[PDB]
Enzyme design. Structure first.
Site, short mmCIF file in Angstrom:
data_model
loop_
_atom_site.label_atom_id
_atom_site.label_comp_id
_atom_site.label_asym_id
_atom_site.label_seq_id
_atom_site.Cartn_x
_atom_site.Cartn_y
_atom_site.Cartn_z
N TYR A 70 -19.71 5.16 -45.72
CA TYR A 70 -19.57 4.53 -44.42
C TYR A 70 -20.77 3.64 -44.15
CZ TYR A 70 -15.81 7.78 -43.14
OH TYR A 70 -14.60 8.43 -43.10
N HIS A 78 -6.44 2.00 -50.59
CA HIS A 78 -7.45 2.64 -49.80
C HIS A 78 -6.95 2.89 -48.37
CE1 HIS A 78 -11.41 3.01 -47.88
NE2 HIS A 78 -11.93 3.21 -49.08
N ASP A 113 -17.34 3.29 -51.38
CA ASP A 113 -18.76 3.37 -51.09
C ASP A 113 -18.89 4.03 -49.71
OD1 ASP A 113 -18.02 0.99 -49.59
OD2 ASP A 113 -20.03 0.13 -49.87
N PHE A 135 -15.88 10.05 -47.24
CA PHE A 135 -14.99 10.08 -46.07
C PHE A 135 -15.37 11.08 -44.99
CE2 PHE A 135 -12.62 8.23 -49.58
CZ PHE A 135 -12.33 7.01 -49.04
N1 6UA Z 1 -15.20 4.13 -45.17
C1 6UA Z 1 -15.41 4.79 -46.32
N2 6UA Z 1 -14.82 4.27 -47.40
C2 6UA Z 1 -14.94 4.84 -48.62
O1 6UA Z 1 -14.39 4.33 -49.63
N3 6UA Z 1 -15.65 6.00 -48.73
C3 6UA Z 1 -16.28 6.53 -47.66
O2 6UA Z 1 -17.06 7.55 -47.91
C4 6UA Z 1 -16.17 5.95 -46.41
#
Ligand code: 6UA
Ligand code: CL
Length: 228
Positions: A71, A192, A69, A82
């Site tokens: 930031y 992740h 999801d 990201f």
């Molecule tokens: N910190 C983040 N974690 C994620 O999984 N995606 C992003 O766009 C940012």
């Protein structure tokens, strides 16, 4: 506005057709976001960026990166997973970890900034499983309706007469694996890049070079991952 305008206005042509099964659902998500604001809660990224990943051409995608999801800090999420605006510093921790692995895997210097638009412009789809978040509250929009939208996106990508490599970062992203079953598709899965999980197998995962070996083995061109 997702609530007010159709997919043919909101996203690129191939994406608008790919997402036709979830047209009503996308409108429903616009209504959800409206209700959040009416209730006194906010969301990220900005409304105009929520669907930004689907503004780059569907037919040109060769690699899919999926996270969880957006930031959760206001000023970070831009609608490409990201990525941050070129003026953002310091980098969020997930991004610093991604760039750590990028240097280790590819041997390139650290990027100058956190803007991943070059990847998006070169056929990398920067998706998240869920496309909005409440500020400061990671995973707060889990289970609110985005999952059907990103499921549909992945099915459509996998159904194309084209090569696809998927990179699934984390548990929520990994729930797309069943849909990725197609002979023209291959999936790389790892923990992740967040500090919460990166040491479980993100570092050393070499996703960028692996993706390129997989593309070349399907007769596709590799991604130029080099950032300025
Ligand atoms: N910190 C983040 N974690 C994620 O999984 N995606 C992003 O766009 C940012
Ligand atoms: Cl809020």
């Amino acid at each position: 506005s997702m609530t007010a305008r159709p997919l043919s206005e909101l996203v690129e042509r191939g994406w608008a057709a790919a997402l036709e099964p979830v047209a009503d659902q996308v409108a429903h998500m616009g209504q959800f976001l409206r209700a959040e604001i009416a209730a006194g809660r906010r969301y990220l990224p900005a409304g105009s960026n929520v669907l930004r990943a689907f503004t780059f051409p569907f037919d040109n995608v060769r690699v899919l990166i999926v996270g969880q999801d957006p930031y959760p800090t206001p000023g970070h999420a831009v609608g490409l997973s990201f990525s941050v605006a070129p003026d953002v510093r310091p980098w969020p921790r997930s991004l610093a970890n991604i760039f750590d692995e990028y240097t280790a895997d590819l041997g390139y210097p650290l990027p100058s900034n956190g803007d991943l638009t070059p990847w998006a412009q070169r056929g990398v789809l920067l998706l998240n499983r869920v496309l909005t978040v409440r500020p400061s509250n990671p995973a707060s929009h889990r289970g609110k309706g985005w999952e059907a939208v990103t499921e549909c996106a992945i099915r459509a990508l996998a159904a194309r007469a084209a090569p696809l490599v998927a990179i699934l970062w984390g548990r929520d992203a990994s729930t797309l694996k069943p849909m990725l079953a197609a002979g023209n598709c291959v999936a790389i899965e790892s923990p992740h890049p967040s500090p919460l999980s990166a040491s479980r197998g993100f570092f050393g995962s070499r996703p960028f070079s692996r993706a390129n070996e997989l593309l070349v083995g399907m007769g596709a061109e590799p991604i130029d991952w080099r950032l300025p």
